[PDB]
Amino acid sequence: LQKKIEEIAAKYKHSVVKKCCYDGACVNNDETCEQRAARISLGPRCIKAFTECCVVASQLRANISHKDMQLGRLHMKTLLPVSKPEIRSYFPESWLWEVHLVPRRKQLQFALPDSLTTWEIQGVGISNTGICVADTVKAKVFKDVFLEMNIPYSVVRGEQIQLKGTVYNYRTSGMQFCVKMSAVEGICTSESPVIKSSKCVRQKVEGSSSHLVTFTVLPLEIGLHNINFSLETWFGKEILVKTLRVVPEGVKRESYSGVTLDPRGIYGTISRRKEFPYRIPLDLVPKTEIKRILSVKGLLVGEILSAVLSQEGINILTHLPKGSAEAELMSVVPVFYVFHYLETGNHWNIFHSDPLIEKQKLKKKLKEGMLSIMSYRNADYSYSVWKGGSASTWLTAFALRVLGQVNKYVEQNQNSICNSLLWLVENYQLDNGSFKENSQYQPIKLQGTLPVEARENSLYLTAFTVIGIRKAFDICPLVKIDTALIKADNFLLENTLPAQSTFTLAISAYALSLGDKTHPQFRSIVSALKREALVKGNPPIYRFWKDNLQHKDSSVPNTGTARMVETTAYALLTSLNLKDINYVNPVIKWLSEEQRYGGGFYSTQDTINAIEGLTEYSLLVKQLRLSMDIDVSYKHKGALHNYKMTDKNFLGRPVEVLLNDDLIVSTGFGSGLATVHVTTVVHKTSTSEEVCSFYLKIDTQDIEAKRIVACASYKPSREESSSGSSHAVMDISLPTGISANEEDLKALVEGVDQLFTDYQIKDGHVILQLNSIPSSDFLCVRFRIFELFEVGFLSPATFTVYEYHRPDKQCTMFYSTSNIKIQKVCEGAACKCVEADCGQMQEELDLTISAETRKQTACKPEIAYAYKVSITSITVENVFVKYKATLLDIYKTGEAVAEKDSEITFIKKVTCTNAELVKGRQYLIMGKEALQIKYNFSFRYIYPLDSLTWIEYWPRDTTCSSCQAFLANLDEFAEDIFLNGC
Amino acid sequence: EQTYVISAPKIFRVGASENIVIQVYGYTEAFDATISIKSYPDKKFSYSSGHVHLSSENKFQNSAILTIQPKQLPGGQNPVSYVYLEVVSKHFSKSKRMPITYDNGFLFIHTDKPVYTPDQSVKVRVYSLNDDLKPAKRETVLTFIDPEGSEVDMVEEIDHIGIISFPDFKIPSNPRYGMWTIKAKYKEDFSTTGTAYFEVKEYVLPHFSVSIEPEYNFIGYKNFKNFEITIKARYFYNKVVTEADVYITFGIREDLKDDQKEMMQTAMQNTMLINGIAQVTFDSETAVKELSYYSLEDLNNKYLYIAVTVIESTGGFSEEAEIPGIKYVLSPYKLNLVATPLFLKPGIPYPIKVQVKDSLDQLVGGVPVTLNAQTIDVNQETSDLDPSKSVTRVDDGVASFVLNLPSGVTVLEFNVKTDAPDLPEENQAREGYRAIAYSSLSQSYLYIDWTDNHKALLVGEHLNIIVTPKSPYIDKITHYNYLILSKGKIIHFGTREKFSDASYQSINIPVTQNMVPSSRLLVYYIVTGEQTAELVSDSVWLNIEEKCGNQLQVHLSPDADAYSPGQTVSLNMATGMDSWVALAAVDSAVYGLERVFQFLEKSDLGCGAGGGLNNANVFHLAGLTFLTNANADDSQENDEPCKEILR
Amino acid sequence: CEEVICHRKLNHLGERVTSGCPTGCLCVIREPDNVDNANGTCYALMS
Amino acid sequence: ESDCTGSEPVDAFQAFSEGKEAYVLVRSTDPKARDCLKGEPAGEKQDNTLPVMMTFKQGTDWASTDWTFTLDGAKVTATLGQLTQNREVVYDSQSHHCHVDKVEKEVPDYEMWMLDAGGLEVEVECCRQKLEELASGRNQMYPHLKDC
Ligand SMILES: *[C@@H]1O[C@H](CO)[C@@H](O[C@@H]2O[C@H](CO)[C@@H](O)[C@H](O)[C@H]2NC(C)=O)[C@H](O)[C@H]1NC(C)=O
Missing domain, CATH: 2.60.40.1930 (Macroglobulin (MG2) domain)
Known part of the structure; x- marks a missing residue:
């Protein structure tokens, strides 16, 4: 067995292809050797070494022992790999890093940092007598007995969470102690506060060890709730302040609304008022607030200015994951465009403090941001999309664009830029002038058959590379790459028309606009691009572009996408390079209103090109004086607030809109041009009415020697080939208390037979990225999972896959890692937390209910509605239960009205048993509030079943034995309620 | 004349x-x-x-x-x-x-930590002195080179006080991992350079802690057949790992700087981690019969690399640990000469001071040392001297010898060995040396020596040197002459009256702060008459206590063995004179470093303990050029400074 | 500005000096930035 | 440019995108044209009639009135309660992005409607040419330029 592996290792000890044999021999019980080698893109020798070592390793692993397997992994794991710099411990930041003038004697007092650390204080004196390294003095901050608690990132409302912790005792002698928990209102605990924070049960830790801590809680309210933990011992008392983040059920969905304020109509029609209506979505999670933030900034560029200058974060594309070098460049995009605005227009007086220090800070952040991509650069100065992956023509072009633009304000290394440009033009430019891609990275999915898709992608890549080379040409103005630019420009000129898509037409037009703008064929391309223009209004208030050609698709989109903003941005930049000022104003208005709170847009490319369009337009037109009285108020409610926007302050902080009324933003006569964006965040219970561009399936299995298997497959659009999607993302939300095996994920990306190109675990999410998801078959990620802490009433999680550059091509699906049913009953006590906030059905035919308590409960000012219904249908949707009922007799209506004998919907949390309703039976139901939805073309009302919702079974006949009297008093109350009007 | x-x-x-x-x-x-x-x-x-x-x-x-x-x-x-x-x-x-x-001054690059993780900021300042060890006040350029050889940042700053504070270097979110280099330089005039290193390593969450404890830090002849190794492992919640699988691989390593190693697939012994502790014994002889070597005479100064993998049994998690190298030691002692120039003066007793150190370069006491010697005279007639024996002084670590040689001797090939009662003859320490006679055409020689060098010279004391000439023309020499050098500069010079009523006379030299941390003394007299004037010279190296000119001292009030988190504490700084002070507070765990006084005396252009083959060689080995109408016959191409010889 | 070989070198003060290309060309070094003594090729600059 | 002949013959239901989209009034010779007038389908197509919700703005107050359209080929008989209004779509763009209505009265007014979502600019310009031809020099109102 050793010699059978000694031969293998000895064969590939100094082999050119050595890694392929190594990760060929790795265990993969889900795919054959040929299926794994089918993904190898490093040549035939790597495929043959991989296949050999894979087959031999699979034959040797038959009927093995654990010691034999581990010894084999010892033989392979040492001789073939090299090494990797990594550290298992973290070191806190140093401090006291200061210089002092010491007149022979100087004392300075401070506070030691909060840490268990042996600090080492080192002094170095400098004087006219030389240098003196003082004796290093030690300062050990140490705690012998201390508690720590492990609080999860988030917890879904209703889940019963076990909070685990540990008390540490480093003293050699054991001791008594007790930890107690701080009871907050929203957090429901099984026990009850004594005097108000839990109880002290004295336990003992043994000397030089630890003791476990557990606290079961059940959050009833959404939001961040403070929880304290007290550790008490005969030697003191410690308080640990903590925070539990409670998240609603269902999926988060985010909609955006944009409005441009032009009070004097300088760039278009006058715009002084706008009304953002309050509309409740269809599948809204019950007892959850509709969140919406209001952001009113000063200029077209004000949102990006606020994003960079307000350092509370921040990424303008947080919904897209890191991993690709594109993300590292996008991190420096906003700082660059802000700096370009402030420097080119000389607007440093916006700062109330010293402008020179602010220009310093921005220059430093710009340099630091520009360094982020250096990891993805290879020795030959090419760039790779994935760290350690193959060099990409596309990404090298993009890096040349960002670097070439940044070089204006932070000078770049000319020799490096030269080597990158020459790597492009010397290797991956064909005779016809086009550029070809080296790697398998597919940034975009285009239409047409395989040949037509090839032509389209070739045109797109050539234009993209041309943009990159043009943006960085002045750094390294070589005659060779100018000749390359000429050949590529010729290819674009000859091959753009006839167009196959507005997207490639636009990017080709913008690439050619960076060169000779007098060529006739370029003018023809600009004409063809103008022919595809869409307008809102006549005379047009808006002008934008759809990425599909008109002769292929005549329908007009109702909401924007990334391709829409990117095509419109390319057309806008082409027009700006042509100085076509009459044509861009409605385009600028459309891109400005399509912008998002934070400054970004839908994906990365549309974001950078739209930011360049807005900024370049802002620098090209006259800067108007800014003076508005902006008042935001609710329609049928109080005035929210108002502020006077001037050039002094115009990046004001956002404001949360809490009330459920329609919002109204208005201004009087003003000077300037402000932007008003509203971001709405809701949580929905369903995803059925969303267009799915992927077939999804996900399951949990038991394995031999629990595991999640998540499969996706691409659904090609119209005229799209079966080649598969472009750069894709598989985001798997993990349920509460479920932890993923990171080794399984590493094994799927680190090898030459990689299935995925990058992975990460962020905030309870397993985020994988991919070059392409197939259309022909399913692709599955498989990774083991384990239970970190115990969770009861586990809320389902989500499985989302989408195209990185087309987040609109997506599909979201719910799943649960627990099979757990049934939900029959909660049995007595240890129960008040589950049944805390939901309704309890009255006792069946209970005659002790005294008709006046049935009226006083109905006439309660808290109780909004109260009437008698008949249930028609039961339905179970995800985490909730919906009851279709008929509204029979109305007894009270405080807020909106519903019609008699109309269909009324009820909703209760599925995790509520004592409110079990039987289909076909009548019930008297009284409660608070409702939801008014617009379904089809009419209204609909949905009523949640919570606490203080009085429900009672109501038979229609009178053969219920003694319930003849029951219905007697029931109809007594029912008769008395409407004849009085309390 | x-x-x-x-x-x-x-x-x-x-x-x-x-x-x-x-x-x-x-x-x-x-x-x-x-x-x-x-x-x-x-x-x-x-x-x-x-x-x-x-x-x-x-x-x-x-x-x-x-x-x-x-x-x-x-x-x-x-x-x-x-x-x-x-x-x-x-x-x-x-x-x-x-x-x-064009090398002038010193540039010390000081980073707060030697190891960084992504998104951290490297705090960096530069201490800049000129050739006279004073604040250079020259503008300085810092360059950052990543592990892939790319210059990724450069920043220059003017210097006001000799301490140059630079902006912090932000490590990227996804950086190039490995060894980063910082290069300091002067923007103008000079070629002086400074260099520092710092590693950027990727953080990986560990499941548990694994510790390896060898029996000793070195492997001698007693543990060449058995070497005990204790492998412990415990969870980070302060509990011992109950059961695990321990796999240990052994290798031979040339040096710790190079990451190359030769594994030994024969000693892949496997054991069980039980209740936190496991133990194995490594038979060095048998395992090093693999990869040739065979004997303990080999492997000397080579290292034993140890690799351990621990696989916890409950959760199946695995964690690794390694010992980079345990130096195989053939002899518990190492010998070195102290204050004994390798030059003979005909007629003067030649002293030899051997010095014994252990594997930690610590002065070992009570160590007997045997000295043998062969002599070659002008007639090439070799003579084998009678062996002598001394015992290591335990007060200073010294084992002193004095040797009387015939006046005609030219070469002395002497060899020293340790004579331990419990060491085999192979495991003894042995060192060889050759001393050549000073050459003079007038048979005129000079030998200087200052009472004795234990203890080391303390600033403020006095140096009572003895000047013994042996020659004809003795009672026509008028005076003695001296030059005192320190840090590559002649700090003193002068002349003392020669007493006609003695052979030797004590020259007193007050040891001053200018002489810290080392100095060189050259004494010579002039033999005159007909033919051509002759300079008869000798030189000695004075090791002086490392004492700051402006002493810095930092203290913490209150003084305690341990402090509590968040405790308000006062730091007291005290200096002899008004001085700048750069402070730092670093988690010591980063060290698992710098010494300036040794890197500072690279500006001493002298080499060896003193002496020379002739007058010109005496001046050369002291770091001096001279202009004389006297005989100046030197060696060939002798223009660059001497280079300290290694063995 | 064609196949003229140029050189990156250190001068007597430690500064990096590049030489070998005639007027109108640029010296491109395909080595890492930390290679003191390197060889490169000249490329024609625009005008 | 191009030729502006589109959608022959003119069908009102086709000009209304078969009741799947909303249209906004952008030009009208009616001096009393409601500001920010937008018509959107308020129900399904039952028989020859079709519910149409009309939103508009009076001052700073938004209002909405429900109407019923009776479609007969190119003619549309709109009505609300007792008020009736006769219209005939006299032109419809090739992609049904905009159309030109003719309302009947003593002085027949002409209106231009277009998709609220936007339309192809060449087709919108064609509808504009048709409306300028029919209006023949009369003053046009632009209800969508009323700060909507
Ligand atoms: C959890 O502990 C924090 C820290 O002590 C509490 O915050 C303090 O509350 C007291 C009143 O109870 C105030 O007088 C202090 O000013 C607060 N300090 C801070 C820093 O906020 C907090 O009230 C505790 N929470 C619970 C639920 O007991």
């Missing part, structure tokens, strides 16, 4: 205040002399010059400080390599070609 001696550093240092000594003899009437550094070879330009007066009031000895200004030298294509040292007077005019260096 009238003579003149011009003493200068072996090499001129651009921008340095170079002190030039002139000592003339035989002159009774006063006269002036001009010392000058001019351009080579035309002497059209005078880089600097000074006038010195020589009189009976002056004892016909004087000094002049010259400076080659950096701005006075061209830049770029055809830079200056040589200058002319020139002395002109009514009596004589002599010049010499002197090489120059």
Whole structure:
């Protein structure tokens, strides 16, 4: 067995292809050797070494022992790999890093940092007598007995969470102690506060060890709730302040609304008022607030200015994951465009403090941001999309664009830029002038058959590379790459028309606009691009572009996408390079209103090109004086607030809109041009009415020697080939208390037979990225999972896959890692937390209910509605239960009205048993509030079943034995309620 | 017969205040002399010059400080390599070609930590001194080179106080992992460089902690058959790992700097981690019979690399640990000479002070040492001396010897060994040495030695040196002459009266702060008459206590063995004189470093413990060039400074 | 500005000096930035 | 440019995108044209009639009135309660992005409607040419330029 592996290792000890044999021999019980080698893109020798070592390793692993397997992994794991710099411990930041003038004697007092650390204080004196390294003095901050608690990132409302912790005792002698928990209102605990924070049960830790801590809680309210933990011992008392983040059920969905304020109509029609209506979505999670933030900034560029200058974060594309070098460049995009605005227009007086220090800070952040991509650069100065992956023509072009633009304000290394440009033009430019891609990275999915898709992608890549080379040409103005630019420009000129898509037409037009703008064929391309223009209004208030050609698709989109903003941005930049000022104003208005709170847009490319369009337009037109009285108020409610926007302050902080009324933003006569964006965040219970561009399936299995298997497959659009999607993302939300095996994920990306190109675990999410998801078959990620802490009433999680550059091509699906049913009953006590906030059905035919308590409960000012219904249908949707009922007799209506004998919907949390309703039976139901939805073309009302919702079974006949009297008093109350009007 | 001696550093240092000594003899009437550094070879330009007066009031000895200004030298294509040292007077005019260096000062790069993780910021400052160990106040350029060889950042800053604070270097979110280099340099005039390193490593969450404890830090002859290794492992919640699988692989390593190692697939022994602790024994002999080696005579100064993998049984998680190398040690002792020049003076007893250290370079006491020696005279007639034996002084670690050789001896090949009662003959320490006789055409020799060197010289005390000449022409020597050098600069010089009523006479030298941390003393007398004047010289190296000129001391009030988190504490800084102080507070765990006093005495152009094959070699080994009308026969191509020899 | 070989070198003060290309070309070094003594090729600059 | 002949013959239901989209009034010779007038389908197509919700703005107050359209080929008989209004779509763009209505009265007014979502600019310009031809020099109102 050793010699059978000694031969293998000895064969590939100094082999050119050595890694392929190594990760060929790795265990993969889900795919054959040929299926794994089918993904190898490093040549035939790597495929043959991989296949050999894979087959031999699979034959040797038959009927093995654990010691034999581990010894084999010892033989392979040492001789073939090299090494990797990594550290298992973290070191806190140093401090006291200061210089002092010491007149022979100087004392300075401070506070030691909060840490268990042996600090080492080192002094170095400098004087006219030389240098003196003082004796290093030690300062050990140490705690012998201390508690720590492990609080999860988030917890879904209703889940019963076990909070685990540990008390540490480093003293050699054991001791008594007790930890107690701080009871907050929203957090429901099984026990009850004594005097108000839990109880002290004295336990003992043994000397030089630890003791476990557990606290079961059940959050009833959404939001961040403070929880304290007290550790008490005969030697003191410690308080640990903590925070539990409670998240609603269902999926988060985010909609955006944009409005441009032009009070004097300088760039278009006058715009002084706008009304953002309050509309409740269809599948809204019950007892959850509709969140919406209001952001009113000063200029077209004000949102990006606020994003960079307000350092509370921040990424303008947080919904897209890191991993690709594109993300590292996008991190420096906003700082660059802000700096370009402030420097080119000389607007440093916006700062109330010293402008020179602010220009310093921005220059430093710009340099630091520009360094982020250096990891993805290879020795030959090419760039790779994935760290350690193959060099990409596309990404090298993009890096040349960002670097070439940044070089204006932070000078770049000319020799490096030269080597990158020459790597492009010397290797991956064909005779016809086009550029070809080296790697398998597919940034975009285009239409047409395989040949037509090839032509389209070739045109797109050539234009993209041309943009990159043009943006960085002045750094390294070589005659060779100018000749390359000429050949590529010729290819674009000859091959753009006839167009196959507005997207490639636009990017080709913008690439050619960076060169000779007098060529006739370029003018023809600009004409063809103008022919595809869409307008809102006549005379047009808006002008934008759809990425599909008109002769292929005549329908007009109702909401924007990334391709829409990117095509419109390319057309806008082409027009700006042509100085076509009459044509861009409605385009600028459309891109400005399509912008998002934070400054970004839908994906990365549309974001950078739209930011360049807005900024370049802002620098090209006259800067108007800014003076508005902006008042935001609710329609049928109080005035929210108002502020006077001037050039002094115009990046004001956002404001949360809490009330459920329609919002109204208005201004009087003003000077300037402000932007008003509203971001709405809701949580929905369903995803059925969303267009799915992927077939999804996900399951949990038991394995031999629990595991999640998540499969996706691409659904090609119209005229799209079966080649598969472009750069894709598989985001798997993990349920509460479920932890993923990171080794399984590493094994799927680190090898030459990689299935995925990058992975990460962020905030309870397993985020994988991919070059392409197939259309022909399913692709599955498989990774083991384990239970970190115990969770009861586990809320389902989500499985989302989408195209990185087309987040609109997506599909979201719910799943649960627990099979757990049934939900029959909660049995007595240890129960008040589950049944805390939901309704309890009255006792069946209970005659002790005294008709006046049935009226006083109905006439309660808290109780909004109260009437008698008949249930028609039961339905179970995800985490909730919906009851279709008929509204029979109305007894009270405080807020909106519903019609008699109309269909009324009820909703209760599925995790509520004592409110079990039987289909076909009548019930008297009284409660608070409702939801008014617009379904089809009419209204609909949905009523949640919570606490203080009085429900009672109501038979229609009178053969219920003694319930003849029951219905007697029931109809007594029912008769008395409407004849009085309390 | 009238003579003149011009003493200068072996090499001129651009921008340095170079002190030039002139000592003339035989002159009774006063006269002036001009010392000058001019351009080579035309002497059209005078880089600097000074006038010195020589009189009976002056004892016909004087000094002049010259400076080659950096701005006075061209830049770029055809830079200056040589200058002319020139002395002109009514009596004589002599010049010499002197090489120059553009290395001036010291640049110490100080980063807060040596290891960083992504998104951290590297705090970095530079301590900048000129050649005279004073705040350079020169603008400085910092360069950052990543593990892939790319220069990713450069920043220059002016220097006001000798401490240069630079902006923090932000490590990227996804950086290049590995060894980063920081390079400090002066923007103008000089070629001085500084260099520091810091690693950027990727953080990986560990499941548990694994510790390896070898029986000893070195492997001797007693543990060459069995070497105990204890492998412990515990969870980070302060509990011992109950059951796990321990796999241990062993390798042979050349040096710890190179990450190359030769594994041994024969000693892959596997054991069980039970209740936190496991133990194995490594039979070195049997395992190193693999990969050749075979014997313990080999493997000496090589290392034993140890690799351990621990696989916890409950959760199946695995964690690794490694010992980089345990040096195989053939002899528990290492020998080195102390304050014994390898040069013989015919007629003077030759002393040999051997020194014994352990594997930690610590002075081992009570160690017997045996000294053997062979002698070769002018007739090539070899003679084997009778062996001698001393015991290591336990007060200073010294084992002293004194040797009486015939006057005609020329070469002394002496060998020293340790004589431990419990060591085999192979495991003893052995060192060989060769000493050559000083050559003089007048059979004239000089030997200096200052009472004795234990303890080391403390600033403020006094150095009572003994000057013993052996020669004809003894009772016609008028005086003795001396030059004291420190840190590559002549700090003192002078002349003492020779007593006609003795063979030796004590010359007293007050040891001053200028002599920290080391100095060199050259003493010579002039033999005159017919033929040509002769300089008879000797030199010694003075190791002096490392004492700061402006001593810094930091203390923490209150003083306690341990502190509590968030505790308000006061730090007291005390200096001898008004001084700047750069402070740092670093988690010591980063170290698992720098010593300035040793890197500072690279500017000493002398080598060895003193002495020389002849007068010119004595001056050369002391870091001196000289101009003389006396005999100046030196070796060939002797223009660069000496290089300290290694063995 | 064609196949003229150029050189990256250190001068007597430690500064990086590049030489070998005639007027109108640029020296491109395909080595890492930390290679002191390197060889490169000249490329024609625009005008 | 191009030729503006589109959608022959003119069908009102086709000009209304078969009741799947909303249209906004952008030009009208009616001096009393409601500001920010937008018509959107308020129900399904039952028989020859079709519910149409009309939103508009009076001052700073938004209002909405329900109407019923009776479609007969190119003619549309709109009505609300007792008020009736006769219209005939006299032109419809090739992609049904905009159309030109003719309302009947003593002085027949002409209106231009277009998709609220936007339309192809060449087709919108064609509808504009048709409306300028029919209006023949009369003053046009632009209800969508009323700060909507
Ligand atoms: C959890 O502990 C924090 C820290 O002590 C409490 O915050 C303090 O509350 C007291 C009143 O109870 C105030 O007088 C202090 O000013 C608060 N300090 C801070 C820093 O906020 C907090 O009230 C505790 N929470 C619970 C639920 O007991």
